[PDB]
């Protein structure tokens, strides 16, 4: 998965940012089973007053999570994972839940490419990880906090 996480400029300190990433990443790991280093969190900072709700300019507290996942998982699982993101971001970022929107879009795994390679289908990530070369495993191996 890639998680586009839109936030106001400077709303998240580096460590705040770190904690929101580890919050999402862990939630995805805990729920899907996918290994950490497949979970990308991409922060998109914009200056305050760029978001608008019902046509009302907003300060700097809004958080929009756009998760892009592989097709394959159930409605129930995705709502658990969306709910856990609303809750664990709320805490990691010290922002009210009322401030957090979370959308999940899905695409066939076979039109999705990470570390230069097409993803496997959900739940069969491990045999996938194993048929990668030495250098590719090493690189992804590093990306586990």
């Amino acid at each position: 998965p890639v998680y586009m996480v839109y936030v106001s400029q400077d709303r998240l300190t580096p460590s705040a940012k770190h904690a929101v990433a580890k919050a999402i990443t862990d939630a995805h790991r805990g729920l899907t089973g996918a290994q950490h280093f497949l979970a990308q969190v991409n922060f998109q900072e914009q200056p305050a007053g760029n978001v608008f709700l019902g046509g009302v300019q907003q300060g700097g507290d809004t958080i929009f999570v756009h998760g892009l996942h592989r097709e394959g998982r159930s409605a129930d699982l995705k709502g658990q994972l969306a709910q856990r993101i609303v809750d664990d971001v709320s805490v990691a970022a010290e922002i009210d839940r009322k401030h957090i929107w979370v959308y999940f879009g899905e695409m066939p795994a076979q039109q999705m490419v990470e570390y230069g390679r097409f993803l496997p289908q959900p739940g069969h990530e491990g045999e996938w990880f194993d048929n990668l070369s030495s250098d590719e495993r090493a690189f992804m191996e590093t990306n586990v906090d």
Copy 2:
């Protein structure tokens, strides 16, 4: 809905952004009936020159509207709302129509969240609002323009 709006830096003043954010929101409200406040308009500004069309760098007039919706609305409707976004953003950003691109994406309501809560289908806008805690109902209230 969340309308992501990709614009070149300084192409829209604060007041330009309002008129755009109000044009999109009014189009969505009027055409869907979904209550005003549910629509977020989110500007992503980049330096001018970060947009290429067929490999040619552009100035700062290009606007891309990515619209992220619940599934359930007909194609004829989605066509209307995209055409009216194109016209109403054009007026409001003082920008020619050829410069405006508009994609709509659809996800199930069950995997979309707003104001920390899980959205309903387009056919449940008013009853959903009524199973909300009064503090949420009053917070969303403040998010309706004028």
Copy 3:
């Protein structure tokens, strides 16, 4: 197509950005037959450290390509196109494959407007072009390289 390209700030020199947009656009015109001027490359630049893999802050080397297409193409063509984008962006921007992510999301053309007009079905680019006003025809023909 719109291709959203999420790069760390200043990693692509202007010259690189140009090469990276030319290559994606050449890839998409080669494999799908759509005319050049139909392909947008939208570069999104964030400060390095905004990208997290497995919850680990990254340097400025990650490239996430998010392509937005018509529905219409086969899983086979789309993996060709994705794979050609990885290899070509690699060369163009001088970045190992391991750093490149590519997601293809698709939508019905009837909710898809470029240059102020709804796009046709993939492969009907010819007659749709042969129905645009002379000014529109002239305008788009400007954006080909």
